[PDB]
Amino acid sequence: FTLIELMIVVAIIGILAAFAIPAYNDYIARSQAAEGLTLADGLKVRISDHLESGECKGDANPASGSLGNDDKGKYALATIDGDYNKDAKTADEKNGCKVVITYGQGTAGEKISKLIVGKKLVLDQFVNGSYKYNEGETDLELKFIPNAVKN
After folding, report:
1. What angle, 0 to 180 degrees and rounded to 10, lies between the N-to-C axes of helices 44-51 and 3-42?
2. Distance (Å, rounded) from C-alpha 9 to C-alpha 13?
3. How many domains is the chain built from?
4. Handedness of CA 80, 44, 47, 122 (dihedral sign)
5. What is the DSSP annotation of the chain?
6. In CATH, what number is assigned to the domain containing residue 100?
7. N-methylphenylalanine: which positions carry it?
């Protein structure tokens, strides 16, 4: 290669990158943020069990098999929260329960995408066991929120 060839190539590559790297970063961050939903889906049974005693949260019980409010992944910690609504009874009202996903509180700590670290994705549960995200409690960029939860 010639100097001018190298200079022209390095130029085009540099410019393409200007657009590519930020798209690559967003995609890494979206990919990591997805762990939140997996965590939250894994908590569905605990929530169900907890609600038998009329509360979203529940202490872990040695004798009963029952478990607590947390599940910790690589990119986030997910915690059961909320105030149960006994009156809510139709598939598309909220039961009052939520899952609070805090990114950067997983096993990887703050060593994860910096686009999400310290961000919160809060998921409201509905009577049918479904999640849609809670805007207002959610810090996480819409860009990074998984589609299944935006309905």
Report:
1. 20
2. 6
3. 1
4. positive
5. --HHHHHHHHHHHHHHHHHHHHHHHHHHHHHHHHHHHHHHHHTHHHHHHHHTTT-S-----TTT----SEEE-SSEEEEEEE---TT--STTSEEEEEEEEEET-STTTT-S-TTTTT-EEEEEEETTS-EEE-BTTB-S-GGGS-GGGT-
6. 3.30.700.10
7. 1
For the four alpha carbons of 49, 55, 61 and 64, in that order, the dihedral sign comes to negative
Structure tokens at 93: 């009202």
Residue with tokens 């860009």: 143
Q: Hey, what are 101's tokens? A: 């996903």
Resolution (angstroms) stands at 2.3
């049974």: which residue's tokens?
A: 45
